[PDB]
Design a protein around this ligand. Structure first.
Ligand SMILES: [Ag+]
Ligand SMILES: [Ag+]
Length: 650
C-alpha cells in the first residue's frame, strides 16, 4: 500500500499518460487545470497570477490542445484568453486525467495538433443499495484554503452523485518579499444522475456551475466573474451484436459568462490607457455531440463515428464619460454577437493486433469547419469590412503508429507519422488588430495551419527500474503567429515552422524503502519563414526526486532544474504573450510527507521552494505598469510556501 505525494507522472502506454487527479501533488496546484499538468513532462504553464494559467505542451499553445471535460469542449470567452479552457476545471472533482501526445488520435475532435487532454469521471458501480463519500481539505501558506466533496448513492439500477469544491488564496508573494497581485477564489458544483437498466446499458444526465474571480498581475483588467455552466447527456450500450461491442452517444452544452474590470479588484492606473473605470462582459455558448461504435472481431478493432459542434460568442461593455462621473455598467447595454463557429466531422481508427507483440494502428478524420463574423462594427467606432461574412474549409487528418514489443525484456518500441490540419480558433480571427500584409483584417486571410509530425519512443517496465522516452520531429505549414508593434498592437500571420523535441524519464527502486526517479523535457522550434527561432518555447527542464517509504508513511525530496532559454524571437508570440528577454536559469527544491492514519483518512504536507528562490519562468507574462512592474519584468513565481492536506474516503 503505502502513500506518497505525486512529484511527476510517467508515460504508461506509448505516447500516453494517465493519472488520478485526486492524489496530492508536490508543487501544489492552484486548483486549476493548467497546474495539474505541470507534473507531466513536456507541459509548461504561462502564469497570469495566482491561478488560471494557460498550458503549453511541447512549445505549442492554445487551440493546438484539446481539453475535454467528460467528453465535451468548454471554451472560455476573453478575447485575451484570461479564462483558458483549463480555467474552468477543478481536477480534484474529476476521477481520471489522461493525455495523448502529438496528432496520434482522431476520436476526440479536430485539429489536435499538439495533443489531447481528457478529464473524465467513471460512472458508479453499485449493485447492492449503497453509497460512498470522499473529500479533502487543504490549508496552505498564503491564506490558501480548499474544500472538495464527492459523494454518490445508488443501487444496481441507478445512482446519484454530487461533486463540488471551494478554493481560494490571498495574494501570494515571492522570494524578494514582494506581494504579487494574485488573489483568487473558485467554486464548482455539479450533479449527475445515472440509469443502468441492466449491466449492458447506461444513460446519464449531468449538470453544474462554477464561479470564480482572480486578480491578474500581468494584465490591465482583473476577472470579477467566470460563470461556467454545463449540461450533459450520454448513452452507452455494450454487446449489441457479436462484432459490435459498444455504442457511445453524447450531447453537451457549456456556457461561459465572464466579467473583467479595472476597479473591482484594483483601482484604475491614473497614468494608464484606462484611468476610467471600465468593465466588459463576454460569454461563449458551446453545443456539441459525438456518436461512435467500436467493432471488435478476429484480430482487429475498429471504432467509427461522427461529431459536430457549434459555438457562439458575444460581448458588451461599460461606459464612463466626460462631464460627470456617471458610470453605466455593461449589464445595461445589450449583448453584441461577433462570431459563430460550426464543425462537423467523421472519424475512424483501425488497430490490428498482428501476432503477440505487434500493433499497427491507423486513423483518419474528415472535418468541415466554418465561421460567420457578426461584428457590424469595430472598437469610438469603425466599420468592419467583413460584417456577416462567412468562411469555410474541409480538413482531413490522420495518422499511423507501429508498436513493437521486444524479444527478451519488458520493452516496447513505437514510431508514428501524423498529419493534422486545423481551423483557426476565435482568437486567431478576431483578437488580432491587423491581418497579414495586404489583408483587410485577420478574419479574411489566415490560413488553417497543417502540421506533419513523426513520433517515436519506448517503454521499459521492469521490476527495480521503470523508464520511458518519447521524441518528435515535425514541420508546420501556415503556423499562426502574433507579432507586436507599439498604444500597442498585434498582427496575426501564417508562417512556416520546423519543430523537434522530446521527453524521457526513469524510476528506480533502490531498496524496498528507497525509490528515486528523474525526468527531462526538451523542446525547440524555428520560424523557417523569417529564419528566426519560434517564440515562446520553454527551455530544458529537469526534475529529480528521492523518496522513502516505510509502512504507513512517506518522505519526499524534489529538485526542479531549469536551463536558460536563449532562443527567443522578440516582439512575437501568441495572443496572450510575447518574447522579449532571454530566460535566466534556476533551481527550486521541495519536500513532502504523507501518512495514512486509517483506511479512510490519510494526511499530507509539503514545503514548496524551500530556499525561497526569487525567480520567474520564461513563458510567464509581463507585469502591469500600474501595479509596480518595471518595463517588461515578468510575473514572479511564489517563494517558500507551506501546505497540508487531508483526504477522507468512505
Ligand atoms: Ag479580459
Ligand atoms: Ag480596460
Amino acid at each position: 500500500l503505502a502513500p506518497s505525494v505525486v512529484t511527476g507522472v510517467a508515460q504508461s502506454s506509448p505516447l500516453t499518460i494517465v493519472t488520478n487527479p485526486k492524489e496530492p501533488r508536490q508543487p501544489v496546484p492552484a486548483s486549476d487545470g493548467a497546474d495539474y499538468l505541470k507534473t507531466i513532462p513536456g507541459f509548461a504553464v504561462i502564469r497570469n497570477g495566482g491561478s488560471n494559467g494557460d498550458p503549453v505542451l511541447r512549445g505549442m499553445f492554445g487551440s493546438r490542445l484539446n481539453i475535454l471535460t467528460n467528453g465535451g469542449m468548454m471554451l472560455g470567452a476573453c478575447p485575451n484568453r484570461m479564462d483558458a479552457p483549463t480555467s474552468y476545471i477543478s481536477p480534484e472533482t474529476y476521477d481520471k486525467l489522461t493525455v495523448i501526445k502529438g496528432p496520434q488520435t482522431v476520436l476526440w475532435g479536430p485539429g489536435a495538433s499538439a495533443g489531447t487532454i481528457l478529464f473524465e469521471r467513471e460512472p458508479e458501480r453499485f449493485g447492492e443499495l449503497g453509497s460512498r463519500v470522499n473529500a479533502s481539505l487543504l490549508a496552505g501558506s498564503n491564506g490558501r484554503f480548499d474544500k472538495v466533496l464527492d459523494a454518490a448513492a445508488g443501487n444496481r439500477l441507478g445512482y446519484l452523485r454530487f461533486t463540488g469544491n471551494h478554493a481560494q488564496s490571498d495574494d501570494y508573494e515571492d522570494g524578494a518579499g514582494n506581494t504579487v497581485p494574485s488573489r483568487w477564489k473558485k467554486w464548482n458544483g455539479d450533479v449527475a444522475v445515472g440509469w443502468t437498466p441492466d449491466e449492458d446499458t447506461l444513460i446519464e444526465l449531468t449538470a453544474g456551475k462554477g464561479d470564480g474571480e482572480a486578480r491578474y498581475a500581468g494584465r490591465g483588467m482583473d476577472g470579477s466573474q467566470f460563470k461556467r455552466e454545463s449540461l450533459g447527456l450520454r448513452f452507452v450500450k455494450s454487446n449489441v451484436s457479436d462484432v459490435l461491442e459498444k455504442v457511445e452517444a453524447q450531447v453537451y452544452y457549456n456556457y461561459a459568462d465572464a466579467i473583467m474590470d479595472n476597479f473591482r479588484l484594483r483601482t484604475p492606473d491614473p497614468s494608464s490607457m484606462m484611468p476610467m473605470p471600465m468593465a466588459s462582459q463576454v460569454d461563449r455558448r458551446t453545443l456539441g455531440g459525438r456518436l461512435a461504435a467500436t467493432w471488435r472481431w478476429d484480430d482487429f478493432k475498429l471504432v467509427t463515428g461522427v461529431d459536430a459542434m457549434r459555438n457562439e460568442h458575444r460581448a458588451r461593455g461599460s461606459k464612463y464619460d466626460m462631464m460627470t462621473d456617471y458610470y453605466t455598467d455593461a449589464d445595461q447595454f445589450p449583448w453584441s454577437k461577433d462570431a459563430v463557429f460550426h464543425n462537423y466531422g467523421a472519424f475512424g481508427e483501425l488497430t490490428w493486433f498482428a501476432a503477440e507483440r505487434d500493433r499497427l494502428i491507423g486513423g483518419l478524420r474528415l472535418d468541415r469547419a466554418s465561421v460567420k463574423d457578426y461584428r457590424q462594427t469595430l472598437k469610438h467606432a469603425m466599420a468592419n469590412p467583413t460584417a456577416n461574412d462567412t468562411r469555410a474549409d474541409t480538413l482531413p487528418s490522420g495518422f499511423v503508429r507501429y508498436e513493437h514489443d521486444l524479444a527478451d525484456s519488458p520493452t516496447t518500441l513505437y514510431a508514428g507519422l501524423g498529419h493534422a490540419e486545423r481551423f483557426p480558433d476565435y482568437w486567431e480571427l478576431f483578437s488580432p488588430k491587423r491581418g497579414p500584409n495586404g489583408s483587410v483584417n485577420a478574419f479574411d486571410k489566415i490560413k488553417p495551419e497543417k502540421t506533419t509530425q513523426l513520433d517515436f519512443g519506448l517503454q521499459y517496465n521492469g521490476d527495480k527500474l521503470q523508464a520511458w522516452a518519447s521524441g518528435y520531429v515535425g514541420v508546420v505549414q501556415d503556423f499562426i503567429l502574433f507579432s507586436y508593434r507599439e498604444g500597442s498592437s498585434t498582427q496575426a500571420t501564417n508562417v512556416d515552422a520546423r519543430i523537434m523535441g522530446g521527453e524521457l524519464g526513469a524510476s528506480y527502486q533502490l531498496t524496498g524503502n528507497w525509490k528515486t526517479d528523474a525526468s527531462l523535457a526538451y523542446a525547440w522550434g524555428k520560424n523557417s519563414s523569417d529564419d528566426r527561432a519560434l517564440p515562446q518555447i520553454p527551455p530544458l527542464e529537469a526534475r529529480f526526486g528521492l523518496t522513502y517509504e516505510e509502512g504507513d508513511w512517506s518522505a519526499g525530496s524534489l529538485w526542479r532544474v531549469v536551463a536558460p532559454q536563449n532562443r527567443i524571437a522578440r516582439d512575437q508570440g501568441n495572443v496572450v504573450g510575447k518574447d522579449f528577454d532571454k530566460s535566466a536559469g534556476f533551481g527550486v527544491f521541495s519536500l513532502n510527507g504523507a501518512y495514512r492514519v486509517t483506511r479512510n483518512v490519510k494526511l499530507s504536507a509539503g514545503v514548496d521552494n524551500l530556499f525561497d528562490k526569487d525567480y520567474t519562468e520564461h513563458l510567464n507574462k509581463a507585469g502591469d505598469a500600474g501595479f509596480g512592474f518595471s518595463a517588461n519584468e515578468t510575473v514572479p513565481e511564489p517563494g517558500r510556501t507551506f501546505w497540508t492536506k487531508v483526504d477522507f474516503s468512505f
